[PDB]
Structure formats: structure tokens, C-alpha cells
Amino acid sequence: KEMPQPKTFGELKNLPLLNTDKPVQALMKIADELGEIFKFEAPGRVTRYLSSQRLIKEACDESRFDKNLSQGLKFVRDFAGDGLVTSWTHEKNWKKAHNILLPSFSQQAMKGYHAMMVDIAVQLIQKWERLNADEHIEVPEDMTRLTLDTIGLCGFNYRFNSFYRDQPHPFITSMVRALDEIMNKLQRANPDDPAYDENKRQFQDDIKVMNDLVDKIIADRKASGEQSDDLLTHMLNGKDPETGEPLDDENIRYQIITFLGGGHETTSGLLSFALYFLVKNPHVLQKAAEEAARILVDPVPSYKQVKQLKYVGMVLNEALRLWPTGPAFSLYAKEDTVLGGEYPLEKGDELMVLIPQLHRDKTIWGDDVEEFRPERFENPSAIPQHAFKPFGNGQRACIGQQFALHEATLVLGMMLKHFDFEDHTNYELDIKETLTLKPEGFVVKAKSKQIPL
Amino acid sequence: KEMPQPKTFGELKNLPLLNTDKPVQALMKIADELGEIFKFEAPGRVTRYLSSQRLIKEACDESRFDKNLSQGLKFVRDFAGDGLVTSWTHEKNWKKAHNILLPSFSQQAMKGYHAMMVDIAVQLIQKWERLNADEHIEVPEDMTRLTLDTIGLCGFNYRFNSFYRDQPHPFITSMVRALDEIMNKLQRANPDDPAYDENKRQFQDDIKVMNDLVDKIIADRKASGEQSDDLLTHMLNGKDPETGEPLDDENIRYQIITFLGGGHETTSGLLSFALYFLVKNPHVLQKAAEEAARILVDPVPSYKQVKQLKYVGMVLNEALRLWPTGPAFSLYAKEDTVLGGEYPLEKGDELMVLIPQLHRDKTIWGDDVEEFRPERFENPSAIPQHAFKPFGNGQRACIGQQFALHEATLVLGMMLKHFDFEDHTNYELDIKETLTLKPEGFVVKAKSKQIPL
Ligand code: HEM
Ligand code: HEM
């Protein structure tokens, strides 16, 4: 069968369709019009967007397709190098680092991070307890403070001290400016044009900032004479069982950058969407609060109590169903293949999985795919293979998934135990896109339940 | 640290604890009571049972510990001699045979076995296709017919023709009766009593049928004048690269018996437990069956398609986590040493790894350790070293591991492609123990999907 394709702009083909603040939301709209697959052509490149579980379960066969670096990720590689997110599977440093850092997300490791997650969570709760009558909460801003600080402390014993700051930490300003520079690069006809010399001067400055903090984190660890078993411990000391080799210096630097960027943004998105859906669905908020109060019976949560917040977990999954905060991942064909018995592909051909659309496939989820209903996840194992993919696929799936979900479950649980929430502006969801998705301008009021912490 | 010890029986010490049909399960229950290590005393022997990954990972250090023959294996050596399973690592014939036969398990060799594995697999599928409307399947019975036939045919070009029989083949009747006589001998206070002279004559009779079949297998091969590149070809003609020597006649006979025994029973257990867990976990059954339908698109599976059954592979590994079919292995201290910083051992001290307990270490796997969740094996690198050992350890690990999993993956794939399964009796798991583990009395109904074979 011949592939649907959205409207074209002459020699620019489809490229102007992504000249927008909201490209993923644009593609989702295309997917609504054209169905489970469409061709997307730009000058000198072609990809195919998949939206159905039927096709995506084939794309997620690792014998037939491997992770591809999208143009965006290729530009990310200019500062994240061969860190885990921006490495090819066949690069030696991918499997090495994969093997070395996976124990940093073991069950023992997760227990060891719990205390410091509580440290940051207490700081959030205290900030909100200390607000005056009628003040509000800037939700994504506060959630980004929490998640940046959490990965900094749990991973690196580094304190960003974001709750002491009116404005994001410099590292994040640089990071966001570098990603912003990257977004703008995706839709430029002449990269080399001298007009863009000021941008790449700014890009080089942003990379300088990120590396300055890297140098510090490393120098502090070397100088604290510490083996505080955390993510950094593993980066500096762990040896890969296959090769018997450690990470080299350069790669460690890239890993720090990678984990500092990747380790917070998607999670803050998740928390912001989850709070959004809770205030728009008071019956769900009430049920989630009921669990928080029944389970979190101590002044601070235990690891085991967090594992027992089953419904809070369902809330977080149902937020990732509707708005997966890393909304796309890219694949390539390992060999010539036919997709879905209809679409022939040649070795090298690229696919894009459009996760938000996958998560709205009515053959999987039923009629009411737009409804926020955490009960869809009562029994997570009922969900078919390759139907719910907010953490990607296979050996290149998110290494930090259990970290993300533990942090988010801890924090949301505490939030529901301690405050009642009001959507006082009747906020209209507005989704900002970077490489990630987040509510923009989401604000709430939190009335303390006056329960000691 | 003082070491826990279960309840005692006067002069008999702990030995009557193993006077049950289900000793490994009894040992697991003790492990749950007493923890990561206990001492077990008999008249004239002591061993320590290990259950934690922390201690087992040390036990698996080959510089400190070498494979020991348990009292059971020492008795098996009465007919398996210095076959690979029943040899000491320091016996010349171990490394010789290991070097000679290890190439018989190369993916190259696997490719050559595939055709004959499908032969037997097709016999099983056809049997089930030919059952009448309300008939059932005796699962362990059929899985044993299949596995025995596979190792006979692929190994030795011998056909047990087990699907043409109601009763097990005489070889397996005698092998089973001989191993049972071993099991009973592990409990007898005065072995030389005249009350057991009937048992000892029958044990010799069972040895004689095994040796009769061996003689025929060798006779058959020689008169054939063939070099059918199989496991028998290597035994008969292969030379050890290190010594430059072939196996002698005697050792060849022992290898044949060893492979015909261990080549089938553990594999048939694995298949039986896997099918058990699938019918108990319908959401996993549907995921596995969907995989099989998507991958096995030809009337007979190819070697390449069997390698694509990733989720089926996960199901098998999760059945090996809960019920590793060879549930224990034994080690001894090569020198005086201290285990786990706390438990001093003298040269020669014996250890027993209790693999089902290892696999239930909550520190490694999480709290939900009794649940059947194949997705624990989605990313191999996420499983700590020495945490999953169904195939033993190091240079003395299972040589047949690849063969076992290829056969099992092929067969379970075809079973899920061709039939729907019903747990019509709501079976209560009943685990029969020999030296190996298997469900007893497990029955299902198979409804054909009427897909041609
Ligand atoms: C809700 C939160 C998160 C979501 C939705 C998410 C999503 C994803 C996705 C979709 C991928 C695959 C990207 C691709 O195929 O190109 C991925 C990879 C990754 N994620 Fe996450 N992530 C989250 C949280 C985290 C956290 C907390 C960390 C670290 C602490 C992290 C570290 C990574 C890394 C290192 C990779 C690359 C893994 C590899 O290829 O070996 N993520 N994530
Ligand atoms: C699921 C199936 C199987 C399991 C769970 C399994 C398990 C084991 C274990 C635990 C050992 C080590 C024993 C010890 O340390 O005392 C072992 C050794 C062995 N297995 Fe397997 N096995 C399986 C299948 C097979 C197959 C199919 C074959 C032959 C075709 C085979 C042949 C052997 C041999 C020859 C050894 C001794 C290797 C040596 O020491 O050099 N096994 N098996």
C-alpha cells in the first residue's frame, strides 16, 4: 500500500509543517487526519510517523529495528556526545556505559536514594506550607526545582539549591537555551549562513557553562575523598563486565551532562501533568488523597510506603498515557523489511514513534481515550505489549524509569497528604514543547491540611 | 558469626529432614526460616546451604571454590562415571571432554540441530491436533516424550519414538528407577542390610538396560559409516586440542548416558513449568501467543525465527527463576577462606547453592518475588552478576544451555501459535522431585487454532 503524506510546500516538501512552536502537537493532528502511518519528507531526508499499536509492535522488534538518532538528538550530541541518550547502540561506549550504570538503578540503589529524595521533597512541601493566604504555586517551575535538585543530590551529591532561587540555576538556563538553539536549527535552510554566527557563539557559551559545572562535580568528589555509592560512584569506579573496562574521562563528562539534563525535565513534566489532571478531575484527586492519607502514616514517607501508593502510581501512568513527556523516539531498519505486511522498507529507513498517538489507539484503549481514568492501570499487565511506551523500547528504554516513578510517587503522595488543591484560574491547558512536553502557565492554590512534616 | 541450623533427630542430626518426597522444597522452607545460610549435619558430613546473592556471588568465585559432587551426584557416578556432569574438574577426562564437546553447542551446531528439533516438535503438535473434542493433555508426560526424543535424534540419530508409546521408553523407566534408588539410598542407615539386596539387583538391572541402549547407539553409528555432524560424531572422532587425545571407549559410554539423561529431564521440567505459569497468567499467555503469531509466519519455524521469539525467551527465564529444574549445585573450598566476612571455612568445606531461594532474594528482585513477570528479563544487563544461575556457574556451567533454550523456545512458540490452552481443572501446583523438579498431574485442554503445519 502507498503511504499517506501531509501537505507539501514545493521544494520544501513537508518541512514547513514543523516551523511551529508546537511540532509534536502538529504531528498528532496530522496523525488524526491520515491514520496509523504517514510519510514525512524534508530536503534530503524522509521519515515515517507511526501511531498505531499494530505497526509499533513491529517497530519495537529489536531484531528488525534499532534506535535511530533523530536530527534533534544528533544536534544534542554536540554537547551530550556519546552519553547514553545520544549514543548509537553499536558504539562501544553505549553498551559499556549501559553495563556500568545499570547497577545505579538496582533495587538496592533505589533504596539508597530514598532519603535524599525525601530531603528535596520536604523542601517543596515546606515552601508551600510557608505561602501566605491567597498566594499561588507556579507548578512546572516548582516541579522543575524539585527534579533538578533530586537528580543533582541523589546522583552526584551536588546541591543546585533551586528552592533558594527566583530564577532557574544557570546550568538549566544554558541547557534550555542550547535546546532552544537546537529547535531553531531544525528549521533552517542555511546552517552555515554568517547570519547565525551569533547563535553558535551563544551555543558555545552554553556548552562552556554545562562543562564548568561538570568539572566542579568531579573535582568535589575527588576532593571529598568519598565513595558515596551513588550514580557518580559507578561512573568513576564501575567496570563493564563484558570489556572489563571503566568509562574514560571524556565519556564520564558526557554522562554527567546527559543525566543532569535527562534526569529531571521529563519527570517535572510528568508531575505537572499529573497535578493538572488531578485538579481537573476532583473525584480522582479525592481517591488519590484517600490513599495518601491511609498509607503515609509517618511524618516522612518510607521506601516501602511509596511502593504501596498503588493509586498514585496509576495516576502517574494515566498522565504518561495522555502526555508522555518524551513524546517521540526514532528507529531505523536493520535490514530490508516489510512493515505490517503493507509497507516495504529498505535497510536504513527511518521510523518515528508518535507516543501520544499510540497512547490514544482506540483498538487498545477503547472509545474514551481522551478521558483521564487511572483505573485503566488497575492491572498494568493487562496492557498488551508495545501499547504503552512512555519510556521507549528495549535495551534503549529509559534507564531512569524506576527512579522517575519513585520520585514522582513520593512527591505526589506527600503533596496529596499535606494540601488541598484549587484550580483557581480554570487553567486552559497550554503545552510548551522543547524536546520535551510541559504545561506552561499552570498555577494552583494549595491550602495546607496542617499535618506536621 | 554463629551459623543457624534446623531441628535435629538425635544421632541422625538433620538427615531425616530430607526423608521426604520433596527435599528441595523442605530446604526452601528452612531457608525462609533461617535466612541466607544454614548448616546441615548428617552422620559423617556437613554442608552449608546458601540462599543469598551476597554469599552466592562469593561462592561462585572459581579462585576460591570448585564444583563438588553432592552425595546424590556421587551415586549417579555409579552409571555416569566420569561423564561431564559427574566428573571432578581436576580429572583429566573433564577438561578433555569439555574441550571436545563444547563445539557441539556452537550456534553453528545449533543451526544443524534445528531441523531435527522441528521433526519432534511437529510430532507433538500433530498429537495435540489429533485429540478429540473434550480430551486433555498430560503436560509433563508429553514434554518428556518430546525432550527425550529431541536429544536422542539430534544427539545420536536415535529415535526413541516416544509419541508411539503409552508407557515411557524402557531407557527412561530404568533411569528414573535408578535415580529413585539413589534418592532412597541417601536415607538408609545400614545400606548393606539384606533387606535392600532386592533394590541393589534391580539397580544393576537398570544399569544394564541403559548400557544396552548405549551399545546399540554405537553399533548403529559404526555400521552406518556416517559422520552425521552430531554430538555422537564429536564423541567418536573429536580430539582434544590441548592433549591431542580423543575420548577413550569407556568415557564415550559415560558421555552417552550423561547426555541422554541430563539432555532431557531438566528441559521437560522447564517446558512444563512455563506452560503452567502461562495458563495461570492469561495476560502473559496472550503476550507470548501474540509474539508467536507475529514471528512464526511460515508453516515450520526457521532457526532465525526462533531467535526472534524474545518474549517467549523471557517466559522461559521467568519459569527458571521461580522453579529452576536443576535446583541445587554443590561447591567446596579450595583453601581456608572466610565467607561474606563472617563465616570461616576450612579447605574442603562443602556449600550447596539453593537456586530457587537465590532467585527469591528480595534484595535483588524486589518484594513481589513470587509473581510471574517475564518483563524482569526484558533487559539482560539489569540482572546483577550471580543473581540468576539456573545453569550453574563458571567453567562447570551447563554445556547444554543453548540447546535447552533453543528447543524450549521453538516448542513453546509452536504450541502458542497452534493452540489455545485452558486450565480446565484449576490445577494446584504439585512439584515432584527426583534430582530434578517437575509439575506432577498437570493437565490442560488445547483448542486448535486450525493453523496448518
Ligand atoms: C517521566 C520521566 C521520564 C520519561 C517519560 C523518560 C523517557 C525516556 C525515553 C522515551 C527514552 C528513550 C529515548 C529514545 O529512544 O531516543 C529515555 C531514555 C533515557 N532516559 Fe528517560 N525518561 C524519564 C526519566 C528519566 C530519568 C529520571 C533519568 C535518569 C535519572 C532518565 C535517563 C534516561 C537515559 C540515560 C536514557 C537513555 C537510555 C539508553 O539509551 O541507554 N530518564 N527516557
Ligand atoms: C532447562 C534445562 C537445563 C537446566 C536447568 C540445566 C541445569 C544444569 C546445571 C544447574 C548444571 C550444573 C550442575 C552442577 O554444578 O553440579 C548443568 C550442567 C550440565 N548440563 Fe545442564 N541443564 C539443562 C539442560 C541441559 C541440556 C539440554 C543438556 C545436554 C544436551 C545438559 C547437559 C549438561 C551437562 C553435560 C552438564 C555438565 C557440564 C560440565 O560440568 O562440564 N543440560 N545443567
mmCIF file of C-alpha atoms in Angstrom, chain A residues 295-402:
data_model
loop_
_atom_site.group_PDB
_atom_site.id
_atom_site.type_symbol
_atom_site.label_atom_id
_atom_site.label_comp_id
_atom_site.label_asym_id
_atom_site.label_seq_id
_atom_site.Cartn_x
_atom_site.Cartn_y
_atom_site.Cartn_z
ATOM 1 C CA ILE A 295 -0.698 4.882 53.583
ATOM 2 C CA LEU A 296 1.639 7.792 54.541
ATOM 3 C CA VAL A 297 1.106 7.446 58.294
ATOM 4 C CA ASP A 298 4.572 8.667 59.378
ATOM 5 C CA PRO A 299 5.973 12.258 59.374
ATOM 6 C CA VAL A 300 8.088 11.348 56.361
ATOM 7 C CA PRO A 301 7.469 8.510 53.845
ATOM 8 C CA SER A 302 9.384 5.251 53.874
ATOM 9 C CA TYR A 303 10.531 3.487 50.714
ATOM 10 C CA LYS A 304 8.021 0.680 51.378
ATOM 11 C CA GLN A 305 5.158 3.174 51.891
ATOM 12 C CA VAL A 306 5.932 4.724 48.495
ATOM 13 C CA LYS A 307 5.741 1.239 46.855
ATOM 14 C CA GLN A 308 2.271 0.913 48.413
ATOM 15 C CA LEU A 309 0.872 4.089 46.783
ATOM 16 C CA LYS A 310 -0.791 1.968 44.111
ATOM 17 C CA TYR A 311 -3.402 4.513 43.000
ATOM 18 C CA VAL A 312 -0.899 7.375 42.982
ATOM 19 C CA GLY A 313 1.111 5.147 40.603
ATOM 20 C CA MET A 314 -1.965 4.644 38.387
ATOM 21 C CA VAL A 315 -2.451 8.456 38.324
ATOM 22 C CA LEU A 316 1.140 8.893 37.125
ATOM 23 C CA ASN A 317 0.728 6.197 34.426
ATOM 24 C CA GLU A 318 -2.500 7.791 33.153
ATOM 25 C CA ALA A 319 -0.713 11.159 32.908
ATOM 26 C CA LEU A 320 2.021 9.425 30.853
ATOM 27 C CA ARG A 321 -0.665 7.831 28.694
ATOM 28 C CA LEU A 322 -2.139 11.171 27.666
ATOM 29 C CA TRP A 323 1.014 13.331 27.676
ATOM 30 C CA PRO A 324 4.208 11.192 27.591
ATOM 31 C CA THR A 325 6.784 13.908 28.315
ATOM 32 C CA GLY A 326 9.421 12.447 25.944
ATOM 33 C CA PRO A 327 6.889 12.187 23.123
ATOM 34 C CA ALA A 328 8.752 10.502 20.288
ATOM 35 C CA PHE A 329 11.554 8.094 19.621
ATOM 36 C CA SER A 330 13.216 7.193 16.375
ATOM 37 C CA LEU A 331 14.161 3.844 14.816
ATOM 38 C CA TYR A 332 15.910 2.588 11.679
ATOM 39 C CA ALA A 333 15.522 -0.667 9.694
ATOM 40 C CA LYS A 334 18.410 -3.077 10.347
ATOM 41 C CA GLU A 335 17.630 -4.882 7.082
ATOM 42 C CA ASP A 336 15.116 -4.753 4.224
ATOM 43 C CA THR A 337 11.724 -5.467 5.722
ATOM 44 C CA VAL A 338 8.009 -5.133 5.210
ATOM 45 C CA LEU A 339 6.020 -3.265 7.815
ATOM 46 C CA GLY A 340 2.549 -4.524 8.649
ATOM 47 C CA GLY A 341 2.533 -6.681 5.502
ATOM 48 C CA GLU A 342 1.796 -3.497 3.525
ATOM 49 C CA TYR A 343 4.773 -1.093 3.655
ATOM 50 C CA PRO A 344 8.197 -2.246 2.321
ATOM 51 C CA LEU A 345 11.240 -0.640 3.957
ATOM 52 C CA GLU A 346 14.875 -0.626 2.917
ATOM 53 C CA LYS A 347 17.845 -1.039 5.283
ATOM 54 C CA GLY A 348 18.472 2.352 6.817
ATOM 55 C CA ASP A 349 14.836 3.584 6.507
ATOM 56 C CA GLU A 350 13.734 5.705 9.482
ATOM 57 C CA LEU A 351 10.624 5.410 11.653
ATOM 58 C CA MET A 352 9.276 7.841 14.267
ATOM 59 C CA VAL A 353 7.014 6.511 17.020
ATOM 60 C CA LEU A 354 4.496 9.171 17.943
ATOM 61 C CA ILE A 355 3.903 8.091 21.524
ATOM 62 C CA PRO A 356 0.904 10.408 22.302
ATOM 63 C CA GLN A 357 -0.978 8.902 19.330
ATOM 64 C CA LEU A 358 -0.032 5.316 20.184
ATOM 65 C CA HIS A 359 -1.483 6.045 23.628
ATOM 66 C CA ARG A 360 -4.800 7.121 22.016
ATOM 67 C CA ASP A 361 -5.255 3.945 19.856
ATOM 68 C CA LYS A 362 -8.936 3.113 20.336
ATOM 69 C CA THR A 363 -8.444 -0.568 19.417
ATOM 70 C CA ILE A 364 -6.276 -0.836 22.577
ATOM 71 C CA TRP A 365 -7.760 1.676 24.976
ATOM 72 C CA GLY A 366 -11.418 1.792 23.916
ATOM 73 C CA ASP A 367 -13.635 4.735 22.981
ATOM 74 C CA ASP A 368 -12.830 7.142 25.760
ATOM 75 C CA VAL A 369 -9.108 7.676 25.037
ATOM 76 C CA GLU A 370 -9.291 11.361 25.903
ATOM 77 C CA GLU A 371 -10.666 10.636 29.416
ATOM 78 C CA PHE A 372 -8.377 10.700 32.482
ATOM 79 C CA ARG A 373 -9.115 7.344 34.143
ATOM 80 C CA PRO A 374 -6.254 5.878 36.289
ATOM 81 C CA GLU A 375 -8.366 2.723 36.725
ATOM 82 C CA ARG A 376 -7.210 1.732 33.209
ATOM 83 C CA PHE A 377 -3.994 0.740 35.036
ATOM 84 C CA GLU A 378 -5.646 -1.292 37.857
ATOM 85 C CA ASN A 379 -3.747 -4.305 36.477
ATOM 86 C CA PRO A 380 -0.838 -2.978 34.415
ATOM 87 C CA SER A 381 -0.096 -6.424 32.996
ATOM 88 C CA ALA A 382 -3.474 -6.265 31.150
ATOM 89 C CA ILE A 383 -1.898 -3.755 28.762
ATOM 90 C CA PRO A 384 -0.713 -5.518 25.542
ATOM 91 C CA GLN A 385 2.983 -5.461 24.524
ATOM 92 C CA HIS A 386 4.144 -2.222 22.867
ATOM 93 C CA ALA A 387 0.923 -0.422 23.683
ATOM 94 C CA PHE A 388 2.189 1.861 26.488
ATOM 95 C CA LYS A 389 5.650 3.167 25.714
ATOM 96 C CA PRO A 390 6.412 6.400 27.667
ATOM 97 C CA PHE A 391 9.906 5.074 28.451
ATOM 98 C CA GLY A 392 10.821 3.929 24.934
ATOM 99 C CA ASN A 393 11.735 0.416 23.900
ATOM 100 C CA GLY A 394 14.002 -2.479 24.679
ATOM 101 C CA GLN A 395 17.681 -2.178 25.570
ATOM 102 C CA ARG A 396 17.429 1.536 24.700
ATOM 103 C CA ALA A 397 14.489 2.105 27.029
ATOM 104 C CA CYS A 398 14.770 4.673 29.774
ATOM 105 C CA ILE A 399 17.366 3.625 32.325
ATOM 106 C CA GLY A 400 15.851 6.062 34.879
ATOM 107 C CA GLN A 401 12.259 4.843 34.721
ATOM 108 C CA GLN A 402 12.058 3.400 38.214
#
